[PDB]
Amino acid sequence: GELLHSLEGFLDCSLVLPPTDAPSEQALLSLVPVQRELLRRRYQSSPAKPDSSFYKGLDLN
Amino acid sequence: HKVYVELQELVMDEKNQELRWMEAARWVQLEENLGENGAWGRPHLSHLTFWSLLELRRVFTKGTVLLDLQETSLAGVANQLLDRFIFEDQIRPQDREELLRALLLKHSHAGELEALGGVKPAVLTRSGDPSQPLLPQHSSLETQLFCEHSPSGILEKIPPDSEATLVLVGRADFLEQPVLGFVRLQEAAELEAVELPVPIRFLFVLLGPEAPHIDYTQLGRAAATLMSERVFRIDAYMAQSRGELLHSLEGFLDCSLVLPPTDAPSEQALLSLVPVQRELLRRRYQSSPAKPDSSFYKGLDLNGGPDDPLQQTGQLFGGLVRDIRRRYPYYLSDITDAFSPQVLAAVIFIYFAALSPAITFGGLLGEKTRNQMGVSELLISTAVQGILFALLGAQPLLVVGFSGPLLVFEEAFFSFCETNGLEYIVGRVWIGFWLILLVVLVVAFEGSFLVRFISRYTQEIFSFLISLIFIYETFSKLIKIFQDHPLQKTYNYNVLMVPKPQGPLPNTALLSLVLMAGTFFFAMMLRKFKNSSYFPGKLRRVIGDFGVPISILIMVLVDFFIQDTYTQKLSVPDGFKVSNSSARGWVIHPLGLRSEFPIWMMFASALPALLVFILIFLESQITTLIVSKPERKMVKGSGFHLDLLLVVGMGGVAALFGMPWLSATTVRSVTHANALTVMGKAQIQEVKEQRISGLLVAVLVGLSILMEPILSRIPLAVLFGIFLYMGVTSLSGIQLFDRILLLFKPPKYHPDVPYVKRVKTWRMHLFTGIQIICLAVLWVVKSTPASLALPFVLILTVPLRRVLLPLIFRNVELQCLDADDAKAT
Amino acid sequence: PLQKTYNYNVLMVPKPQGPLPNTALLSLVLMAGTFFFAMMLRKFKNSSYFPGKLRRVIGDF
Numbered sequence: 053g054e055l056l057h058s059l060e061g062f063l064d065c066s067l068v069l070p071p072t073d074a075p076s077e078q079a080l081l082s083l084v085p086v087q088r089e090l091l092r093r094r095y096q097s098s099p100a101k102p103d104s105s106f107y108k109g110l111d112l113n
Numbered sequence: 114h115k116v117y118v119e120l121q122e123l124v125m126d127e128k129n130q131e132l133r134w135m136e137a138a139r140w141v142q143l144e145e146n147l148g149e150n151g152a153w154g155r156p157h158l159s160h161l162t163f164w165s166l167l168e169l170r171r172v173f174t175k176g177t178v179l180l181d182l183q184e185t186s187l188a189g190v191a192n193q194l195l196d197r198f199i200f201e202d203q204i205r206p207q208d209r210e211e212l213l214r215a216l217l218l219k220h221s222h223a224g225e226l227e228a229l230g231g232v233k234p235a236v237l238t239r240s241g242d243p244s245q246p247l248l249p250q251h252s253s254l255e256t257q258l259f260c261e262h263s264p265s266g267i268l269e270k271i272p273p274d275s276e277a278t279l280v281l282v283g284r285a286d287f288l289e290q291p292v293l294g295f296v297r298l299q300e301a302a303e304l305e306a307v308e309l310p311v312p313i314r315f316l317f318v319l320l321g322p323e324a325p326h327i328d329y330t331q332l333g334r335a336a337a338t339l340m341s342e343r344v345f346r347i348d349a350y351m352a353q354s355r356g357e358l359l360h361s362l363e364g365f366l367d368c369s370l371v372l373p374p375t376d377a378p379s380e381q382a383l384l385s386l387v388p389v390q391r392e393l394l395r396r397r398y399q400s401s402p403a404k405p406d407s408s409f410y411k412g413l414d415l416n417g418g419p420d421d422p423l424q425q426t427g428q429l430f431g432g433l434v435r436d437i438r439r440r441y442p443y444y445l446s447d448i449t450d451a452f453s454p455q456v457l458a459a460v461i462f463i464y465f466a467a468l469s470p471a472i473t474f475g476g477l478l479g480e481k482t483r484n485q486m487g488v489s490e491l492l493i494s495t496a497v498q499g500i501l502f503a504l505l506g507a508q509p510l511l512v513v514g515f516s517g518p519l520l521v522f523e524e525a526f527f528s529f530c531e532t533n534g535l536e537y538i539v540g541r542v543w544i545g546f547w548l549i550l551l552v553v554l555v556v557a558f559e560g561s562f563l564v565r566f567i568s569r570y571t572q573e574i575f576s577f578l579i580s581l582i583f584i585y586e587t588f589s590k591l592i593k594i595f596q597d598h599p600l601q602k603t604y605n606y607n608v609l610m611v612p613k614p615q616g617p618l619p620n621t622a623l624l625s626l627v628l629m630a631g632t633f634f635f636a637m638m639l640r641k642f643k644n645s646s647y648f649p650g651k652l653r654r655v656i657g658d659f660g661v662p663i664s665i666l667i668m669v670l671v672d673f674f675i676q677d678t679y680t681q682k683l684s685v686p687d688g689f690k691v692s693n694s695s696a697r698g699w700v701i702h703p704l705g706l707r708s709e710f711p712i713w714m715m716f717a718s719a720l721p722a723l724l725v726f727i728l729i730f731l732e733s734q735i736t737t738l739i740v741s742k743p744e745r746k747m748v749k750g751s752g753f754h755l756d757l758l759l760v761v762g763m764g765g766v767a768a769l770f771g772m773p774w775l776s777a778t779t780v781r782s783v784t785h786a787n788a789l790t791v792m793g794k795a796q797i798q799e800v801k802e803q804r805i806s807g808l809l810v811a812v813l814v815g816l817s818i819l820m821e822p823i824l825s826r827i828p829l830a831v832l833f834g835i836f837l838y839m840g841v842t843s844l845s846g847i848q849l850f851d852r853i854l855l856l857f858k859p860p861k862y863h864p865d866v867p868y869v870k871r872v873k874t875w876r877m878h879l880f881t882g883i884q885i886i887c888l889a890v891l892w893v894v895k896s897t898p899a900s901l902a903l904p905f906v907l908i909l910t911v912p913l914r915r916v917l918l919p920l921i922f923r924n925v926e927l928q929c930l931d932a933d934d935a936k937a938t
Numbered sequence: 939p940l941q942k943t944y945n946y947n948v949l950m951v952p953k954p955q956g957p958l959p960n961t962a963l964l965s966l967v968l969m970a971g972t973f974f975f976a977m978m979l980r981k982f983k984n985s986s987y988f989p990g991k992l993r994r995v996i997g998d999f
């Protein structure tokens with residue numbers, strides 16, 4: 053399930069370029085801001101798990 | 114050949130709860146969106162998403178299609194569409210009554226936005242009242258990037274005879290699965306939904322409930338983008354059933370290029386996909402009657418190779434005509450591009466930067482040659498040779514003016530003429546004549562290609578030694594100011610200061626040092642603030658572009674407020690008078706002024722002319738090489754033969770009138786080029802090239818004699834800080850300076866440049882040591898009384914790189930170190 | 939203050955009586971120089987222009 057969720061997140065932050073008659077350089081360079089925004093949306097969460105390494109009491113607080 | 118596409122959403126008005134259709138995007142070969150304000154954003158290409166395309170394909174594989182429908186009004190189309198939905202078991206019979214009322218509703222365009230106060234997304238229910246969506250929502254992407262006059266362009270772009278398409282989207286909670294309806298009218302008819310007079314032929318209807326991985330705005334955008342393409346439009350114009358549309362959609366999906374997210378995106382890697390895209394486009398047109406529009410409109414059918422500024426040509430005067438044809442077609446652009454305030458700031462800076470050395474050298478020359486040539490002559494010559502060179506020159510970023518070696522030659526010539534018993538101002542006419550003949554002969558045979566043999570070695574050596582000597586001279590001037598007014602316990606008052614202050618003065622030296630330090634500090638602080646992030650960008654850049662004039666004004670005001678203390682000020686001659694009217698005139702008779710001129714001198718004056726030609730040619734060509742390197746984003750070409758011809762000809766003509774000849778200056782030209790440089794957030798984004806700045810500088814230098822009241826209040830010590838700032842700033846691009854700096858860093862912190870990775874450290878150090886030995890020898894011979902033999906030594910550096918070094922190093926090391934290009938090695 | 943003339947017989951045994959020519963500017967120069975040198979050495983401490991041991995020892999003083 054975690055791998056499936058990660059794949060869904062991967063597919064959410066991808067963009068498709070349809071066949072456009074514009075010059076190649078302009079069409080390919082127009083993607084920089086949109087891609088930057090999508091990646092900024094990709095890396096914003098980065099949550100995995102809290103610091104649950106050990107629930108120690110240690111007898112001395 | 115082009116059509117109009119309109120996309121509308123079912124939304125609600127904030128003022129009073131009601132439902133209505135609002136347009137959200139328009140398509141004329143490009144996508145335009147509108148924000149909440151009500152003003153359309155800038156046009157841009159369309160970039161869909163994976164989910165929108167996937168869901169569009171899924172819903173279109175089974176959606177119903179009505180072809181050749183015989184209806185004219187919206188109600189008849191909605192009735193037939195709902196009947197077809199009912200027949201194909203798409204919706205239940207208990208849902209027609211609500212959908213019919215939902216579709217037959219008032220349509221409001223952008224012009225009615227502010228009258229209502231804005232709209233919000235709404236969801237239709239079974240009852241018919243709006244409600245908020247249950248699933249979470251997110252801010253739109255396109256309206257955040259592009260949205261944050263138009264009617265005339267919109268009405269102009271649409272061809273006079275064309276059809277339009279309308280797409281409607283909206284959510285309905287009483288539905289099970291999304292439904293797509295595509296209907297093409299038998300004959301185009303006007304519709305009440307679109308206010309534009311263009312008739313409507315196609316109609317898209319996208320309905321359905323809320324579901325994950327489905328966004329109806331993006332799905333409508335995908336449908337509009339699919340309709341906008343020519344091939345799919347032609348297929349729909351000839352399709353007779355759903356199979357043809359499905360095949361066209363599969364073809365459209367096949368030729369799509371999807372790119373995944375990355376970690377560190379770059380504009381260089383993203384440009385490695387240029388061919389692939391092209392190929393895909395061709396495939397999309399492989400099996401269609403249409404043809405691509407930009408078949409060869411993305412690349413120039415020329416070469417960036419054999420087209421070089423300097424090259425041997427089989428015909429006489431080839432370089433001159435080549436440079437003229439390369440440069441002059443840009444004259445209107447050169448005139449126009451000077452409307453930015455940065456040009457004004459550069460003009461103000463270069464005015465002082467060029468006025469001060471002219472005055473100093475004119476005074477020194479006047480006191481050296483018994484006032485045969487003084488300050489006014491040099492000022493007039495500089496003004497005229499700047500105005501003409503800016504109006505008819507090939508490289509308008511050069512700054513002409515008097516130099517040091519020319520002064521040394523003038524001193525030597527005057528001493529020789531005094532010793533031999535001949536006149537001084539007359540032989541210069543014949544030297545100028547020989548210069549004219551020599552430059553004509555040289556330019557006729559395009560003998561400037563030797564400039565190709567000068568590598569980066571000599572350029573770096575020359576620039577470094579020039580900057581270092583400049584800084585040394587500035588500090589020498591400061592120490593002289595200290596020496597004139599020492600720090601004592603007793604000072605005599607009632608001293609006479611009318612011609613010049615006799616004896617020491619109390620608070621002069623320390624005040625001068627303070628003013629210089631303050632000017633330098635303020636200039637550096639404003640330079641740092643230019644690249645900061647402490648204000649709005651426009652105002653920040655406007656303030657930072659005027660740093661030098663602001664600092665000059667601040668320090669001038671600070672000096673002006675002080676009353677009793679004396680500081681040296683700038684002085685210019687009273688009027689346009691010759692320095693010595695007793696033994697000189699405005700025009701010099703070549704035959705003789707007071708005594709006849711010997712014939713042997715007229716025939717033998719060619720020898721100093723050759724030396725003057727060598728000096729001027731070498732300095733000007735090296736300066737042009739340094740200024741116009743490929744790294745500093747120099748788009749327009751720079752000529753070599755035309756500049757040399759103009760400079761030497763102008764020098765000869767000025768020598769006819771008694772004014773001195775000039776040459777291009779390295780530090781001033783580099784400062785002028787750096788002032789007119791627009792930097793990007795670093796990277797040199799562009800360099801502003803124009804002819805107005807040089808012309809204005811020359812005019813101001815010429816008119817400086819008319820501005821005594823303003824120039825008399827500018828202290829001399831303030832300009833020393835500006836000179837130090839110029840000298841420090843002109844040292845950035847030098848590579849030998851970096852290699853000297855690396856002599857102190859440990860090898861752990863060395864940069865990632867090729868000449869560090871390819872070669873070892875103790876070979877780089879040997880290279881730098883050899884170059885420093887050459888610099889030291891040049892300095893020593895400069896201080897030696899045999900100064901006139903200095904330029905030859907410089908050209909003697911050229912064989913050293915060509916013969917001696919290949920006997921010590923290896924080819925890879927020498928090619929990596931002595932790189933002709935900066936970025937490429 | 940900064941004047942044109944100064945008295946040349948001024949007793950300064952307990953304290954300098956009357957103005958003196960070059961004291962104010964020399965004091966300002968010394969203050970600015972000390973501050974500038976201290977800041978430059980503080981910056982050089984964190985630089986990479988010498989061996990680390992000698993660089994840190996110099997920057998500490």
Ligand SMILES: CCCCCCCCCCCCO[C@@H]1O[C@H](CO)[C@@H](O[C@H]2O[C@H](CO)[C@@H](O)[C@H](O)[C@H]2O)[C@H](O)[C@H]1O
Nearest residue numbers: 517518520521578579728731732895896900903904907
């Ligand atoms: C162009 C060929 C290659 C050039 C390489 C770079 C070298 C350029 C600078 C070298 C020439 C310097 O130009 C001039 O030289 C003389 C030599 O002492 C200097 O010193 C001179 O000062 C004044 C004249 O100005 C004289 O009274 C003095 O006797 C003389 O020594 C000048 O202050 C400097 O202006």
Ligand SMILES: CCCCCCCCCCCCO[C@@H]1O[C@H](CO)[C@@H](O[C@H]2O[C@H](CO)[C@@H](O)[C@H](O)[C@H]2O)[C@H](O)[C@H]1O
Nearest residue numbers: 581582584585586587588589590591592593594595596
């Ligand atoms: C090695 C890198 C160099 C870049 C950094 C340089 C920093 C140190 C610069 C200070 C150099 C001192 O500069 C010093 O100026 C005074 C000016 O009065 C000269 O003094 C000389 O020339 C002046 C004319 O200007 C004469 O009136 C005077 O009689 C004569 O001694 C010294 O000969 C020179 O040595």
Ligand SMILES: CCCCCCCCCCCCO[C@@H]1O[C@H](CO)[C@@H](O[C@H]2O[C@H](CO)[C@@H](O)[C@H](O)[C@H]2O)[C@H](O)[C@H]1O
Nearest residue numbers: 627628630631632634671674675676677939940966970
């Ligand atoms: C080191 C880098 C930083 C750069 C900063 C440099 C600061 C330089 C400060 C200069 C010292 C100011 O010097 C002081 O200025 C004021 C100007 O208001 C002068 O003028 C002051 O006194 C005179 C007469 O007493 C009044 O007429 C005047 O209204 C008053 O302002 C003082 O006579 C002078 O003593």
Ligand SMILES: CC(C)CCC[C@@H](C)[C@H]1CC[C@H]2[C@@H]3CC=C4C[C@@H](O)CC[C@]4(C)[C@H]3CC[C@]12C
Nearest residue numbers: 637638639640641642643644645646647648656
């Ligand atoms: C308003 C004018 C007169 C004074 C401007 C103040 C300038 C000189 C000072 C104030 C704050 C300073 C900035 C503070 C933060 C940084 C970030 C660093 O990564 C680069 C230097 C930079 C950008 C400093 C440059 C100098 C700076 C901009």
Ligand SMILES: CC(C)CCC[C@@H](C)[C@H]1CC[C@H]2[C@@H]3CC=C4C[C@@H](O)CC[C@]4(C)[C@H]3CC[C@]12C
Nearest residue numbers: 977978979980981982983984985986987988996
């Ligand atoms: C006291 C002797 C040994 C050294 C004095 C020179 C020091 C004070 C000065 C001279 C040039 C200055 C350097 C100039 C350039 C930079 C680059 C920057 O990225 C780090 C700071 C650093 C390195 C500056 C630190 C201070 C500096 C090294």
Ligand SMILES: *[C@@H]1O[C@H](CO)[C@@H](O)[C@H](O)[C@H]1NC(C)=O
Nearest residue numbers: 482483484485693694695696
């Ligand atoms: C002008 O020239 C004359 C003759 O050469 C000379 O006597 C006079 O001193 C000159 N004036 C100056 C140097 O101011």
